Amino acid sequence: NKFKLNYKPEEEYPDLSKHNNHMAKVLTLELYKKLRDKETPSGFTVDDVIQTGVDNPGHPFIMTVGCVAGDEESYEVFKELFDPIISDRHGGYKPTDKHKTDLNHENLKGGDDLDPNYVLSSRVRTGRSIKGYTLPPHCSRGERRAVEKLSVEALNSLTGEFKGKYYPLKSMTEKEQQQLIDDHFLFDKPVSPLLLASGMARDWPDARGIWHNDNKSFLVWVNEEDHLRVISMEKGGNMKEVFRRFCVGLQKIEEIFKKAGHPFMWNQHLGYVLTCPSNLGTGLRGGVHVKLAHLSKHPKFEEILTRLRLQKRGTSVFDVSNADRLGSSEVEQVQLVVDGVKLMVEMEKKLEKGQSIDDMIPAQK
Template sequence: MPFGNTHNKFKLNYKPEEEYPDLSKHNNHMAKVLTPDLYKKLRDKETPSGFTLDDVIQTGVDNPGHPFIMTVGCVAGDEESYTVFKDLFDPIIQDRHGGYKPTDKHKTDLNHENLKGGDDLDPNYVLSSRVRTGRSIKGYTLPPHCSRGERRAVEKLSVEALPASAFWVPGYPLGARKARSQAETEVLQTCDWEPGAPHPCPPVPKGRDCVWTKECIYFPGHNDNKSFLVWVNEEDHLRVISMEKGGNMKEVFRRFCVGLQKIEEIFKKAGHPFMWNEHLGYVLTCPSNLGTGLRGGVHVKLANLSKHAKFEEILTRLRLQKRGTGGVDTAAVGAVFDISNADRLGSSEVEQVQLVVDGVKLMVEMEKKLEKGQAIDDMIPAQK
């Protein structure tokens, strides 16, 4: 109900303790921060579009926790959510982003020429490379809160704006969706989705679409060809992805930066720039993606290093994280891991991708030594 808040005013007929959710079995950042006193303080507040505290926390109430990751447990419904409910969001952001304080300022750097190296990751070990981010469009509420009309307006703006980008060819607009092959359907379901992860949006929100590009050629479950694509109205207004087979992260990042900046320029000319501020960087639906919203990752074979006693410690020191190749809930297949940057907020896009490039290169060198039966103790890095 983006533009009416009768439901929240009705709740005020009940005492705060009668409305306070039972979080006794919850394990997420929201449950750690939200107290009865804080709930009482914030529950009657709302953003200009009508997003309330209960709207903010509903995903964390519905999803008590996750077996593999510490979830955030709350979402923003509009740009103003982070201000109106800052007493809740600020400590969550600080906890989730390594002590990032309310007074800190974020850095943005989308100059791909500032990345050092990245074109020499050994393709015998690095199977594919990818960089993705999200963007929110000013003037509209965010996907957990926006109306059907807003979703359609975002889609219309995207379909009108993106043809001006060099990367565009038509995809499947909602108003004229054509039949998809089974392979294409599987791609739409898997190319950037994290199966099983708590999600603030309906499973198939109205207005969700995939905008295909000239370079976008997929095989289900694989990133086999050069690609650049845009999702519309998923978790964020836009999800921009660049990926290709092999270890040329430099080229993947170049295409990502060039395409993303062209898209941003087009949206600015249309009177709808992206949401951004000095403190939070790019404003996105989930607090975990504030800042750059960027996840730069590679699928890399680490058959020996992954069995090493200090594998987890090495990842932590390099400020990297691992997943299975099928997403956050999956295990490695054939000792192939999805290795990506752990940080989003407080460091720039270039810095985050640089950590991936340097860290993966070091881990491949470690893997080669372990294959020869040699020790790697002298290669274990200091904490980044």
């Protein structure tokens, strides 16, 4: 987190000998030395952007990024360090490759309405950073508060079906915590020996809260991982309607933020900037809680997912979600989820009557 130019780069250079994370793969004595004296206009330095990676040796299988931006300029300034990491974590997205950001919910081709008897629920999460303020791993309580004020104010104005309420984390607990908890709402502390190693859980829970309509269908976290972490989920599997309220909520949030002089920082190369290079672009996670009692058992499962450009986590229901973030647009992405999920179900079904199946090649569904 610190470094003294009075020392020779070789001495300050970290001992990444046993590290398994992107930052480790590209950071070199040569590179270090180059930008070990450059700094963002808000004092952010490489030693800072690389510190969480140096502390977290990661793990052989699951590979972590290894760094975080402390402000919008961190990308331009430490370009020589982030660029390779991005084009190493995003299918080789090149320093030239553009980025499509399409938030028109209509362009969501069909994504009709899939089998409820198979999809427990669909949701769309995303992050946003209000510009003019530093990012979580570096903003002062000062900044952090302003972000919340602005954020809350902004939200409070929202009427219609987006009429909700703010809930500061300090003034909270089970009476709402547990509720909000077992009712999946509020957010806990990034306690992870990775997130707290990021140095961004400082002054918890000051200036942090959950906001949400009365319908509890559109939640928004303030100052957690990034300035804003809007989430639009619904029960069942109306991925279409979900991704609708999503695009519109954002459309409106931003409009307020814009008229106040604080638009969400985005640039046509990276798209939307956030703390983690691996959530850059649309920073979107469209997903559903499918119930594939059998499709999973099938050994070609993985590849099917792979060829569909999807992921999943432990939850026989799974959390299949879109895999791309950079290069692909929001709509395209959510799309890759509906089509992909529909095939998962059509299959799962055919598996229900001991029948064989047929898939396809990557870059679809």
